């Protein structure tokens, strides 16, 4: 409910449930009603029974996966390079052997990289022992680099979006890709139209406002609308329950839901006193825990943990493939015997 002119006459009346109260359809407004000047002109408000402010709401960003086992840290070219260089150093070893045990040397190098305990050869020629040391050094270097940059991958998070509030200049000169929204004829709308500066965005806001909350929620879930502006103590619970949405940080103008009564009913002070006494005896907070802060989906967009079988594919498939690809060559070699 807001105020507006009617019938193209000098009559300025009150649409909506507040207007209903003004005319004599009921004598108390128990609902999430806001507080502001216009409404406070002629209606008496109880002391505030819940404090909050305005805030924003956007579709939660989508994260990055666990990993494809071996994709992230290396390029295929690196794999090929090391693969060939193994046999390179192997044959060079064998040459330094003969010039002054091939099937040994291949083992020797492949093990030196793979850290496997297997293998029994050695560099007989001092010429080769001069080389083996640095070969091992290279091995250590490469494996260390690998682990380091895997660590680097797992800790740098996603970019900016973080719509800040009423000051993110993405909200002062709207490109026609953004669309705000608020509920028509609602306290928020009043807070805008009366402010002078914000006027611009007001117009950009005007051509899209919705009919009620649920429509707006459901319309930002499915990407048909970028940002939604509303009252916190609804948005917080809403994000907590269904958890692919999120609020962003700032508040706008701290106001409090309160009970509302017609102009000077004889009931004011009793109601106010009861509300206060309620806030003192924790009873209010019992309500709180019973209806608001009961459920928790995720938070802390860091998310620096929790890898699982998604990694296990690229490697367990490899080990099973090793199993299945052994038997064929085993048969082949027992035949070659």
């Amino acid at each position: 409910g807001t105020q507006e002119r009617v019938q193209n006459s000098n009559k300025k009346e009150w649409n909506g449930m507040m207007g209903e109260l003004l005319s004599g359809q009921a004598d108390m407004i128990v609902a999430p009603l806001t507080i502001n000047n216009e409404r406070a002109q002629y209606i008496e408000f109880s002391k505030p029974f819940k404090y909050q402010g305005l805030t924003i709401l956007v579709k939660k960003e989508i994260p990055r996966s666990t990993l494809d086992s071996f994709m992230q840290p290396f390029q295929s070219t690196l794999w090929l390079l090391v693969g060939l260089s193994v046999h390179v150093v192997a044959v060079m070893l064998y040459l330094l052997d003969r010039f002054s045990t091939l099937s040994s040397a291949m083992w020797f190098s492949w093990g030196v990289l793979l850290n496997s305990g297997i293998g029994e050869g050695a560099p007989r020629s001092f010429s080769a022992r001069i080389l083996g040391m640095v070969w091992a050094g290279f091995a250590m270097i490469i494996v260390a680099s690998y682990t380091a940059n895997l660590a680097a991958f797992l800790v740098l998070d996603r970019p900016e979006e973080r719509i800040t509030g009423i000051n993110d200049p993405r909200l002062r000169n709207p490109s026609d890709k953004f669309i705000y929204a608020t509920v028509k004829q609602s306290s928020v709308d009043i807070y805008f139209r009366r402010q002078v500066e914000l006027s611009t965005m007001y117009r950009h806001m005007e051509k899209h406002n919705y009919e009620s909350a649920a429509e707006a929620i459901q319309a930002v879930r499915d990407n048909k609308l970028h940002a939604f502006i509303w009252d916190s103590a609804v948005l917080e619970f809403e994000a907590s329950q269904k958890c692919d949405l999120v609020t962003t940080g700032e508040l706008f103008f701290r106001s409090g839901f309160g009970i509302g009564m017609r102009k000077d009913s004889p009931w004011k002070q009793q109601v106010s006193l009861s509300i206060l006494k309620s806030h003192e005896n924790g009873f209010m907070e019992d309500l709180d825990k019973t209806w608001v802060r009961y459920q928790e989906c995720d938070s802390r967009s860091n998310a620096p943990a929790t890898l699982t079988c998604e990694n296990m594919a690229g490697v367990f498939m490899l080990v099973a493939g090793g199993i299945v690809a052994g038997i064929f060559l085993i048969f082949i070699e027992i035949a070659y015997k």
């Binding site: 330094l96 010039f99 010429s127 080389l131």
Partner: protein, 42 residues
């Protein structure tokens, strides 16, 4: 003050250093072998 890049896949772009170390090792080693040989028959 955007945080920084998030590298990936580490192409041959940088490992050129380690590969050069390897190759230079090979060269100097064979050098020393030929040296030791030519000295040894002497």
């Amino acid at each position: 003050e955007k945080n920084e890049v998030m590298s990936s896949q580490l192409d041959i772009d940088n490992m050129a250093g380690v590969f050069y170390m390897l190759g230079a090792a090979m060269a100097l080693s064979l050098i020393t072998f030929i040296s030791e040989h030519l000295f040894y028959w002497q």
